Amino acid sequence: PLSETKCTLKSFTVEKGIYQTSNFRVQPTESIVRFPNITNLCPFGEVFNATRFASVYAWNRKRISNCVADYSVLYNSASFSTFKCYGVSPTKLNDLCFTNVYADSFVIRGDEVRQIAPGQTGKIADYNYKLPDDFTGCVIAWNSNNLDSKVGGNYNYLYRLFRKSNLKPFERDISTEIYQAGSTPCNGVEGFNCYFPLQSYGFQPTNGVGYQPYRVVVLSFELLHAPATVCGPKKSTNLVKNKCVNFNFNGLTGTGVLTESNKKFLPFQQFGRDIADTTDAVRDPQTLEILDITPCSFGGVSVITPGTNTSNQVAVLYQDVNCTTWRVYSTGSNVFQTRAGCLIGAEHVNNSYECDIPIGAGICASYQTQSQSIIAYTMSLGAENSVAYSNNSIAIPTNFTISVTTEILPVSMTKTS
Amino acid sequence: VDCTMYICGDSTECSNLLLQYGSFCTQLNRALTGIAVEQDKNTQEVFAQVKQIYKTPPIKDFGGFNFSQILPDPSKPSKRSFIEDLLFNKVTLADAGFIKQYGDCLGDIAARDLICAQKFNGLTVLPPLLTDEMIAQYTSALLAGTITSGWTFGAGAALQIPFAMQMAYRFNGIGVTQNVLYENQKLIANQFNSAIGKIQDSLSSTASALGKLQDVVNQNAQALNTLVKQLSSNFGAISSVLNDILSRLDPPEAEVQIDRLITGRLQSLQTYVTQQLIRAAEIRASANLAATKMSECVLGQSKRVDFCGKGYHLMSFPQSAPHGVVFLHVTYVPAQEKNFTTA
Amino acid sequence: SECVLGQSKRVDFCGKGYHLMSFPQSAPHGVVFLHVTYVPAQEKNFTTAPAICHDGKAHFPREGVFVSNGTHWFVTQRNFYEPQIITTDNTFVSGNCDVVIGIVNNTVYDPLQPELD
Amino acid sequence: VDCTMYICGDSTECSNLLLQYGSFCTQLNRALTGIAVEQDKNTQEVFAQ
Ligand SMILES: *[C@@H]1O[C@H](CO)[C@@H](O[C@@H]2O[C@H](CO)[C@@H](O)[C@H](O)[C@H]2NC(C)=O)[C@H](O)[C@H]1NC(C)=O
Ligand SMILES: *[C@@H]1O[C@H](CO)[C@@H](O[C@@H]2O[C@H](CO)[C@@H](O)[C@H](O)[C@H]2NC(C)=O)[C@H](O)[C@H]1NC(C)=O
Ligand SMILES: *[C@@H]1O[C@H](CO)[C@@H](O[C@@H]2O[C@H](CO)[C@@H](O)[C@H](O)[C@H]2NC(C)=O)[C@H](O)[C@H]1NC(C)=O
Ligand SMILES: *[C@@H]1O[C@H](CO)[C@@H](O[C@@H]2O[C@H](CO)[C@@H](O)[C@H](O)[C@H]2NC(C)=O)[C@H](O)[C@H]1NC(C)=O
Ligand SMILES: *[C@@H]1O[C@H](CO)[C@@H](O[C@@H]2O[C@H](CO)[C@@H](O)[C@H](O)[C@H]2NC(C)=O)[C@H](O)[C@H]1NC(C)=O
Ligand SMILES: *[C@@H]1O[C@H](CO)[C@@H](O[C@@H]2O[C@H](CO)[C@@H](O)[C@H](O)[C@H]2NC(C)=O)[C@H](O)[C@H]1NC(C)=O
Ligand SMILES: *[C@@H]1O[C@H](CO)[C@@H](O[C@@H]2O[C@H](CO)[C@@H](O)[C@H](O)[C@H]2NC(C)=O)[C@H](O)[C@H]1NC(C)=O
Ligand SMILES: *[C@@H]1O[C@H](CO)[C@@H](O[C@@H]2O[C@H](CO)[C@@H](O)[C@H](O)[C@H]2NC(C)=O)[C@H](O)[C@H]1NC(C)=O
Ligand SMILES: *[C@@H]1O[C@H](CO)[C@@H](O[C@@H]2O[C@H](CO)[C@@H](O)[C@H](O)[C@H]2NC(C)=O)[C@H](O)[C@H]1NC(C)=O
Ligand SMILES: *[C@@H]1O[C@H](CO)[C@@H](O[C@@H]2O[C@H](CO)[C@@H](O)[C@H](O)[C@H]2NC(C)=O)[C@H](O)[C@H]1NC(C)=O
Ligand SMILES: CCCCC/C=C/C/C=C/CCCCCCCC(=O)O
Ligand SMILES: *[C@@H]1O[C@H](CO)[C@@H](O)[C@H](O)[C@H]1NC(C)=O
């Protein structure tokens, strides 16, 4: 605490006085990791290894649940020319659980891969597949030029070219109603100013890169605000109660003390929040207990310092302890408890004196000989006196003193500009 | 304020970023410390005008006057007078004793108890240097002073004077011959005693008079609760929670989001300090006036027409209350006039 | 203005004691005052009474207090003991001896009758 | 001060964003209201004796 005062003040010398410091803190001692005990691997072999993909015209949407997202399984043979995460840094994918996970899946032309990202325009972004402005997932794609290509062309892949308006996020439209152009009425018949809305792709093996087919998978998911059943590969640990710990509950990390709670969460609520939106309760993923989480730090400390040019002894006042183990930095032989807190290191005396180095709530301190130490004492209030007040007695001065005293009053400040 | 706890409570990555933006954290505390010191000086200036703590005389024969509701009640463990007891009971403080142990908040309760919620976010309250018992001793001395010595209990050594004579001189001060006090001494004592009884009952029945002291308490409590509530603001960040940012983002991206929250949190703290500082200027002005009235209404006889209540000032007695001083001002008001011819 | 250019009667202005006079002095960024005050000293306790009973009429001090030692009553000013003989010049007469509480019996001196005799 | 009009006058997208940064808008008005009340008290104290 004395050094903390010196750093705060940018000085190697501290004047006699009371200095405030940081609230008393403790460190976490161990890390608790809790995930639901999911044993199945996610269907990477179906999402990325399908015999057939949907056309962008009518894209598929697969729901993923109850699995481990161990994507390292792709490293032995998959290759992805495009990969970008929007709602999470990719390096964090293994410490998190995901919920509401869906994999959209389709085939597009290579020059169209860039239109998948949110905020883009073009025939795919406007008429076939659109991500929302606030998309929170990951987009992955690869060059399937030896799977989706055919020598005479592969005409099984379609895209929408004509529409009267743009799509909203994640909408599909598989209507084949003929498109009317040029304000020229059309009764379902291809012709002048009337078009079948869909067109095929070529995808011959001899086309240049921009015309090779690409497989696109979009993984849409949400993080940290709901129960989750798709979760990364990090291993769990045992849970330790009533100690300061580090933790990870389904991807939500932080530190604090885990205790049993009387809060009862509704079946669909995974986490709670306090008045300032800080998580203060969680449902444990394996045993469904509700735990409260409290901060590890708490308290308040101040240091009683004789000038450092006189002595290096200090006394420390702890505002949040009773001292009758303790949330203190150390315990010495001199422990005094008062209304202002627990004072450790000062000797206490039964005398009273004029105040110096005020502590609070009736207590002051000073550095004294009897071979010197810091002493805590109560304040005097001047000295006691009395009057006679007999009902027939009057005191009258017989002499006087003319005295001169001084008084100082500041008048002005340094003017600045 | 623990300006690190308010911004980066229990978070290493945030705490290290905060070091660069660190001169501001220190500056906020310097201003608050200066205010905190001034508040004890204000209390001392208003009440500690007497270095001689006079005991209540053993003789209660103050003519026909009572004063027992004003003087300390010896049956209590405290030295509060009956009227002070009422004043202390009506002004409500958020809590008392200033100690909450960690174990006391180790549960769901931490989120329901506003004081605990303030402590966990780095906001604390420091105890006053003087206690209620010490203030009661100062008010006791002032009363012993004016009940027995009057004018001269200050400006020199206290001299005793019979109580009736003391008022006789206060009447000459007003401009009424002393003969009135002696001839009407029984009437005067009875009117005084009845007036005190009315004050006692008035204070017992209606607490609205004390709203000024209650307002000081409520305003500070609200400012601290506001700082806790403002923690939820995003300030342009993805989330107001550092843990959400740190879990989902890598360091270089997290740093942007954290910096937005750090700047925003300092903005809340600077706003707080400025408001406390302005309010401190206002409370000081009140304290200076209170000190002036103590000296001019209690330690002497003011002749200022609008001091010490309405009427001609005759005498006064201070009483303490949480966060302030309440005065009982005794004035002389003429009555039942008749119109006469003059020249 | 109130301590230097005039004589304040406010009890807590111009230092402690009764204000008598003052002199300003300047200093960097402010003013320092030298305040001269009068403080009473060396008090003694005397017997007192609110009035004196003469011939049934009650005599009140014109100014000051009626004060006495073991054998005689005198009238003095309040802030500096200076006993004077109680005479009809130094007192108000009103009411009577059956009204004032604490009235004592003490002959009041008539300054003129002995000159006329 | 209508602290919404000053920031997002006639603008829906701005107004909704401002809700997150909303405790500050309220706090400004509380301070101004307190001042406004004091100003009538000042007039009354000087003249209504
Ligand atoms: C996707 O399919 C490929 C085959 O086309 C799988 O890769 C083969 O895995 C076996 C077993 O480990 C190896 O013996 C083969 O040599 C691999 N083939 C190639 C070309 O590398 C791949 O594992 C499947 N991916 C997923 C996620 O199931
Ligand atoms: C959702 O359906 C509505 C209703 O059919 C579409 O709005 C109409 O669009 C046609 C042109 O295709 C206009 O002639 C109509 O006047 C519109 N009606 C209304 C009530 O606005 C809307 O465009 C469709 N949404 C999407 C994304 O396609
Ligand atoms: C420290 O804790 C003790 C209790 O362990 C407090 O002392 C008690 O105070 C109550 C009145 O509030 C008494 O009825 C008990 O008899 C006391 N118990 C003991 C063992 O003394 C003590 O007040 C606390 N310290 C501070 C500064 O608050
Ligand atoms: C001052 O007033 C109090 C009442 O407020 C007087 O105390 C009461 O005295 C009667 C007897 O005459 C008792 O029956 C009551 O119980 C007492 N009440 C209380 C609250 O103590 C007191 O005697 C008066 N003192 C003087 C000097 O007049
Ligand atoms: C001055 O007014 C007071 C009342 O304010 C008079 O005193 C009251 O007299 C009535 C009888 O007429 C009694 O019943 C009350 O008990 C008295 N009150 C008190 C407090 O003693 C007083 O007599 C009037 N004096 C003059 C000269 O008119
Ligand atoms: C002073 O004398 C007047 C009469 O000359 C008393 O009567 C009032 O006089 C005023 C001034 O002309 C009128 O406005 C009122 O209407 C009169 N009163 C009534 C009831 O008619 C007045 O009361 C006397 N003052 C005192 C103190 O007795
Ligand atoms: C006034 O007279 C008293 C004696 O009646 C003097 O003595 C003090 O009286 C008080 C009141 O009873 C006691 O508490 C003190 O202990 C007495 N003093 C001593 C030394 O015993 C008192 O000194 C006289 N005042 C003056 C100014 O002379
Ligand atoms: C009270 O004061 C009076 C006046 O000073 C004293 O009276 C005089 O005492 C001297 C002796 O010291 C005599 O020579 C005078 O003749 C006395 N004057 C009168 C008018 O009698 C008196 O002695 C003092 N009394 C006490 C008890 O101290
Ligand atoms: C001052 O107090 C004394 C008592 O300390 C009062 O003395 C009483 O005087 C009357 C005569 O007027 C006697 O009958 C009583 O016996 C005395 N009482 C005692 C206990 O001896 C004195 O009257 C009071 N003086 C004033 C002005 O109040
Ligand atoms: C002042 O002197 C008168 C006498 O002139 C005293 O009055 C007498 O007191 C006695 C005892 O109570 C009565 O028996 C007499 O009848 C009273 N006489 C008259 C004329 O009233 C009076 O007490 C003395 N006063 C003081 C303060 O000593
Ligand atoms: C020369 C035109 C007039 C210039 C004025 C500015 C016009 C703005 C339009 C720019 C062209 C945007 C084309 C985007 C690519 C669509 C390709 C596709 O989806 O397949
Ligand atoms: C497995 O999951 C069930 C249901 O959530 C739970 O009760 C059980 O304790 C878990 N077990 C382990 C790690 O053995």
Side-chain angles (χ1 to χ4, degrees), chain A residues 109 111-112 114-115 121-126 161:
Chain A
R109 175 178 289 168
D111 286 338
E112 297 176 319
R114 67 177 174 80
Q115 293 178 42
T121 64
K123 69 176 77 65
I124 301 303
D126 296 311
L161 179 61

PDB file of all heavy atoms in Angstrom, chain A residues 109 111-112 114-115 121-126 161, ligand 11:
ATOM      1  N   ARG A 109     -21.645 -19.130 -59.335  1.00  0.00           N
ATOM      2  CA  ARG A 109     -20.501 -18.907 -60.214  1.00  0.00           C
ATOM      3  C   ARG A 109     -19.353 -18.298 -59.411  1.00  0.00           C
ATOM      4  O   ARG A 109     -19.589 -17.441 -58.574  1.00  0.00           O
ATOM      5  CB  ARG A 109     -20.930 -17.995 -61.345  1.00  0.00           C
ATOM      6  CG  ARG A 109     -19.897 -17.569 -62.244  1.00  0.00           C
ATOM      7  CD  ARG A 109     -20.401 -16.722 -63.329  1.00  0.00           C
ATOM      8  NE  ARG A 109     -21.180 -17.449 -64.285  1.00  0.00           N
ATOM      9  CZ  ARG A 109     -21.941 -16.878 -65.231  1.00  0.00           C
ATOM     10  NH1 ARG A 109     -22.025 -15.573 -65.318  1.00  0.00           N
ATOM     11  NH2 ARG A 109     -22.601 -17.632 -66.084  1.00  0.00           N
ATOM     12  N   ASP A 111     -17.320 -15.802 -59.896  1.00  0.00           N
ATOM     13  CA  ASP A 111     -17.297 -14.344 -59.820  1.00  0.00           C
ATOM     14  C   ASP A 111     -18.391 -13.784 -58.914  1.00  0.00           C
ATOM     15  O   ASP A 111     -18.453 -12.583 -58.680  1.00  0.00           O
ATOM     16  CB  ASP A 111     -17.441 -13.711 -61.202  1.00  0.00           C
ATOM     17  CG  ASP A 111     -16.200 -13.820 -62.080  1.00  0.00           C
ATOM     18  OD1 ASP A 111     -15.120 -13.997 -61.553  1.00  0.00           O
ATOM     19  OD2 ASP A 111     -16.337 -13.741 -63.288  1.00  0.00           O
ATOM     20  N   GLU A 112     -19.299 -14.632 -58.461  1.00  0.00           N
ATOM     21  CA  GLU A 112     -20.399 -14.244 -57.606  1.00  0.00           C
ATOM     22  C   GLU A 112     -20.096 -14.506 -56.137  1.00  0.00           C
ATOM     23  O   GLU A 112     -20.888 -14.158 -55.269  1.00  0.00           O
ATOM     24  CB  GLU A 112     -21.671 -15.001 -58.000  1.00  0.00           C
ATOM     25  CG  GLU A 112     -22.178 -14.704 -59.399  1.00  0.00           C
ATOM     26  CD  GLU A 112     -23.397 -15.541 -59.836  1.00  0.00           C
ATOM     27  OE1 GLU A 112     -23.484 -16.747 -59.573  1.00  0.00           O
ATOM     28  OE2 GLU A 112     -24.250 -14.954 -60.430  1.00  0.00           O
ATOM     29  N   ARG A 114     -18.133 -13.109 -54.105  1.00  0.00           N
ATOM     30  CA  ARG A 114     -18.040 -11.844 -53.418  1.00  0.00           C
ATOM     31  C   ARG A 114     -19.400 -11.228 -53.080  1.00  0.00           C
ATOM     32  O   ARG A 114     -19.464 -10.321 -52.262  1.00  0.00           O
ATOM     33  CB  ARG A 114     -17.271 -10.849 -54.264  1.00  0.00           C
ATOM     34  CG  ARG A 114     -17.996 -10.451 -55.529  1.00  0.00           C
ATOM     35  CD  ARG A 114     -17.296  -9.438 -56.323  1.00  0.00           C
ATOM     36  NE  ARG A 114     -17.993  -9.227 -57.578  1.00  0.00           N
ATOM     37  CZ  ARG A 114     -19.090  -8.476 -57.747  1.00  0.00           C
ATOM     38  NH1 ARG A 114     -19.655  -7.838 -56.748  1.00  0.00           N
ATOM     39  NH2 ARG A 114     -19.592  -8.399 -58.945  1.00  0.00           N
ATOM     40  N   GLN A 115     -20.496 -11.682 -53.698  1.00  0.00           N
ATOM     41  CA  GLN A 115     -21.805 -11.095 -53.433  1.00  0.00           C
ATOM     42  C   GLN A 115     -22.502 -11.684 -52.237  1.00  0.00           C
ATOM     43  O   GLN A 115     -23.601 -11.254 -51.902  1.00  0.00           O
ATOM     44  CB  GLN A 115     -22.763 -11.280 -54.600  1.00  0.00           C
ATOM     45  CG  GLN A 115     -22.438 -10.561 -55.812  1.00  0.00           C
ATOM     46  CD  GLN A 115     -23.437 -10.869 -56.884  1.00  0.00           C
ATOM     47  OE1 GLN A 115     -24.673 -10.955 -56.682  1.00  0.00           O
ATOM     48  NE2 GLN A 115     -22.902 -11.067 -58.071  1.00  0.00           N
ATOM     49  N   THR A 121     -24.552  -6.041 -53.531  1.00  0.00           N
ATOM     50  CA  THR A 121     -25.586  -6.013 -54.569  1.00  0.00           C
ATOM     51  C   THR A 121     -25.173  -6.895 -55.724  1.00  0.00           C
ATOM     52  O   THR A 121     -24.012  -7.298 -55.808  1.00  0.00           O
ATOM     53  CB  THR A 121     -25.791  -4.615 -55.129  1.00  0.00           C
ATOM     54  OG1 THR A 121     -24.594  -4.189 -55.789  1.00  0.00           O
ATOM     55  CG2 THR A 121     -26.110  -3.681 -54.043  1.00  0.00           C
ATOM     56  N   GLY A 122     -26.096  -7.176 -56.636  1.00  0.00           N
ATOM     57  CA  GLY A 122     -25.783  -8.012 -57.793  1.00  0.00           C
ATOM     58  C   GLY A 122     -26.875  -9.045 -57.983  1.00  0.00           C
ATOM     59  O   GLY A 122     -27.730  -9.218 -57.124  1.00  0.00           O
ATOM     60  N   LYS A 123     -26.829  -9.824 -59.043  1.00  0.00           N
ATOM     61  CA  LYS A 123     -27.945 -10.743 -59.220  1.00  0.00           C
ATOM     62  C   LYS A 123     -28.115 -11.760 -58.091  1.00  0.00           C
ATOM     63  O   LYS A 123     -29.232 -12.219 -57.861  1.00  0.00           O
ATOM     64  CB  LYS A 123     -27.878 -11.484 -60.543  1.00  0.00           C
ATOM     65  CG  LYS A 123     -26.764 -12.477 -60.664  1.00  0.00           C
ATOM     66  CD  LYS A 123     -26.836 -13.241 -61.970  1.00  0.00           C
ATOM     67  CE  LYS A 123     -26.356 -12.466 -63.190  1.00  0.00           C
ATOM     68  NZ  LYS A 123     -24.896 -12.130 -63.150  1.00  0.00           N
ATOM     69  N   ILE A 124     -27.068 -12.122 -57.358  1.00  0.00           N
ATOM     70  CA  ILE A 124     -27.302 -13.079 -56.299  1.00  0.00           C
ATOM     71  C   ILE A 124     -27.749 -12.333 -55.083  1.00  0.00           C
ATOM     72  O   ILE A 124     -28.787 -12.637 -54.486  1.00  0.00           O
ATOM     73  CB  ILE A 124     -26.064 -13.914 -55.959  1.00  0.00           C
ATOM     74  CG1 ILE A 124     -25.584 -14.688 -57.188  1.00  0.00           C
ATOM     75  CG2 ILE A 124     -26.343 -14.842 -54.774  1.00  0.00           C
ATOM     76  CD1 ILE A 124     -26.589 -15.609 -57.832  1.00  0.00           C
ATOM     77  N   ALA A 125     -27.026 -11.292 -54.739  1.00  0.00           N
ATOM     78  CA  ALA A 125     -27.380 -10.553 -53.545  1.00  0.00           C
ATOM     79  C   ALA A 125     -28.788  -9.974 -53.616  1.00  0.00           C
ATOM     80  O   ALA A 125     -29.461  -9.858 -52.599  1.00  0.00           O
ATOM     81  CB  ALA A 125     -26.401  -9.442 -53.318  1.00  0.00           C
ATOM     82  N   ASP A 126     -29.242  -9.579 -54.792  1.00  0.00           N
ATOM     83  CA  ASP A 126     -30.555  -8.995 -54.887  1.00  0.00           C
ATOM     84  C   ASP A 126     -31.679  -9.982 -55.170  1.00  0.00           C
ATOM     85  O   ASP A 126     -32.794  -9.784 -54.676  1.00  0.00           O
ATOM     86  CB  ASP A 126     -30.590  -7.954 -56.006  1.00  0.00           C
ATOM     87  CG  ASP A 126     -29.666  -6.737 -55.785  1.00  0.00           C
ATOM     88  OD1 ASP A 126     -29.694  -6.161 -54.726  1.00  0.00           O
ATOM     89  OD2 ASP A 126     -28.951  -6.360 -56.719  1.00  0.00           O
ATOM     90  N   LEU A 161     -32.795 -14.558 -62.424  1.00  0.00           N
ATOM     91  CA  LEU A 161     -32.324 -13.356 -63.058  1.00  0.00           C
ATOM     92  C   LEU A 161     -33.348 -12.247 -63.000  1.00  0.00           C
ATOM     93  O   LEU A 161     -32.997 -11.075 -62.891  1.00  0.00           O
ATOM     94  CB  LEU A 161     -31.966 -13.632 -64.503  1.00  0.00           C
ATOM     95  CG  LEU A 161     -31.479 -12.444 -65.295  1.00  0.00           C
ATOM     96  CD1 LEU A 161     -30.209 -11.868 -64.707  1.00  0.00           C
ATOM     97  CD2 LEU A 161     -31.234 -12.870 -66.656  1.00  0.00           C
TER      98      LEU A 161
HETATM   99  C1  LIG E  11     -21.887   3.660 -67.041  1.00  0.00           C
HETATM  100  C2  LIG E  11     -23.103   3.645 -66.090  1.00  0.00           C
HETATM  101  C3  LIG E  11     -23.480   5.028 -65.488  1.00  0.00           C
HETATM  102  C4  LIG E  11     -22.451   5.576 -64.440  1.00  0.00           C
HETATM  103  C5  LIG E  11     -23.108   6.181 -63.145  1.00  0.00           C
HETATM  104  C6  LIG E  11     -23.011   5.248 -61.915  1.00  0.00           C
HETATM  105  C7  LIG E  11     -23.673   4.092 -61.876  1.00  0.00           C
HETATM  106  C8  LIG E  11     -23.600   3.123 -60.681  1.00  0.00           C
HETATM  107  C9  LIG E  11     -23.612   1.692 -61.251  1.00  0.00           C
HETATM  108  C10 LIG E  11     -22.499   0.970 -61.396  1.00  0.00           C
HETATM  109  C11 LIG E  11     -22.513  -0.457 -61.991  1.00  0.00           C
HETATM  110  C12 LIG E  11     -22.768  -1.523 -60.895  1.00  0.00           C
HETATM  111  C13 LIG E  11     -22.685  -2.975 -61.451  1.00  0.00           C
HETATM  112  C14 LIG E  11     -22.476  -4.021 -60.316  1.00  0.00           C
HETATM  113  C15 LIG E  11     -22.077  -5.430 -60.848  1.00  0.00           C
HETATM  114  C16 LIG E  11     -23.294  -6.351 -61.162  1.00  0.00           C
HETATM  115  C17 LIG E  11     -22.849  -7.746 -61.717  1.00  0.00           C
HETATM  116  C18 LIG E  11     -23.807  -8.914 -61.436  1.00  0.00           C
HETATM  117  O1  LIG E  11     -24.632  -8.868 -60.490  1.00  0.00           O
HETATM  118  O2  LIG E  11     -23.745  -9.940 -62.162  1.00  0.00           O
END
